[PDB]
């Protein structure tokens with residue numbers, strides 16, 4: 001599923017991401033935009049052999065099991081495929097654990113390079129929330 005900007009904002013809000021660990025909604029929408037272009041089925045392979053999955057590009061070396069990332073952890077206790085669903089619940093639940101792990105949203109490279117320190121409120125402009 002390719003979400004519309006406001007449509008994703010509403011689903012994230014519904015799932016309790018607005019101000020989760022002090023990160024306003026605009027931060028999450030900005031991260032999704034640059035990580036996957038709002039496509040739940042996005043996948044990208046990394047040089048270490050791990051793969052990033054879904055709307056939030058969650059990595060198989062640490063958070064999910066894809067059966068092909070030797071000696072990786074599965075901190076969210078889920079198969080990576082669960083993260084590609086049209087329903088963002090699994091991705092959001094796993095995102096909450098990631099952001100709480102010590103580095104905040106710096107765990108998302110695109111957030112750190114294209115969202116951090118910008119006017120993120122712009123990502124929720126005109127949305128009915």
Ligand SMILES: CC(=O)N[C@@H]1[C@@H](O)[C@H](O[C@@H]2O[C@H](CO)[C@@H](O[C@@H]3O[C@H](CO)[C@@H](O)[C@H](O)[C@H]3NC(C)=O)[C@H](O)[C@H]2NC(C)=O)[C@@H](CO)O[C@H]1O
Nearest residue numbers: 052056057058059060061062063075098101102103107108
């Ligand atoms: C969205 C996503 O999947 N992002 C990936 C990053 O999570 C990953 O960064 C590494 O993540 C782990 C797990 O959070 C970091 O380990 C944690 O580090 C802090 C101290 O910095 C410590 O308090 C935690 O105990 C420790 N957690 C665990 C479970 O050991 C680790 O520091 C991150 N590594 C780097 C270089 O930033 C990166 C890199 O694998 O991939 C992203 O895709």
